[PDB]
Amino acid sequence: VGSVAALLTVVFYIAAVMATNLYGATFPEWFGDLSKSLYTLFQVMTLESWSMGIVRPVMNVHPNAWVFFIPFIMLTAFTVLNLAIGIIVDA
């Protein structure tokens, strides 16, 4: 259960470093510092305005931005679901 929570933190930092690099210069309010990034990725992770509010405007500059965001969503939603059941089994 704790191994999954650690794995998520590692994945979350790698993607926030990557996003900062790719979309920072073009989208500064969303991916400027690594701090702005980790916040935006959590927002995308909870699904809140992920497409109409972040991905669609980003794709208007980077047409393949979906190759980054869609897998990140599928991964973090699977990891969170796997982490959720870990607590369920332990009880």
Please say whether the beta carbons of 40 and 54 come within 8 A: yes
Task: Enter the tokens of residue 43.
Answer: 């927002």
Which residues, 36 to 65, sit near ligand 2CV by CB under 6 A? Answer: 36, 38-39, 42, 59, 63-64
2 is an interface residue for ligand 2CV by CB under 6 A: no
Choose the one of a second copy, Na ion, ligand 2CV, none that binds residue 6, judging by a C-beta under 5 to 8 angstroms depending on kind: none
Please say whether the beta carbons of 51 and 42 come within 8 A: no
66 is an interface residue for ligand 2CV by CB under 6 A: yes
Choose the one of ligand 2CV, a second copy, Na ion, none that binds residue 81, judging by a C-beta under 5 to 8 angstroms depending on kind: a second copy
Residues near 55 by Cβ (< 8 Å), separated by ≥ 6? 44, 65, 66, 69
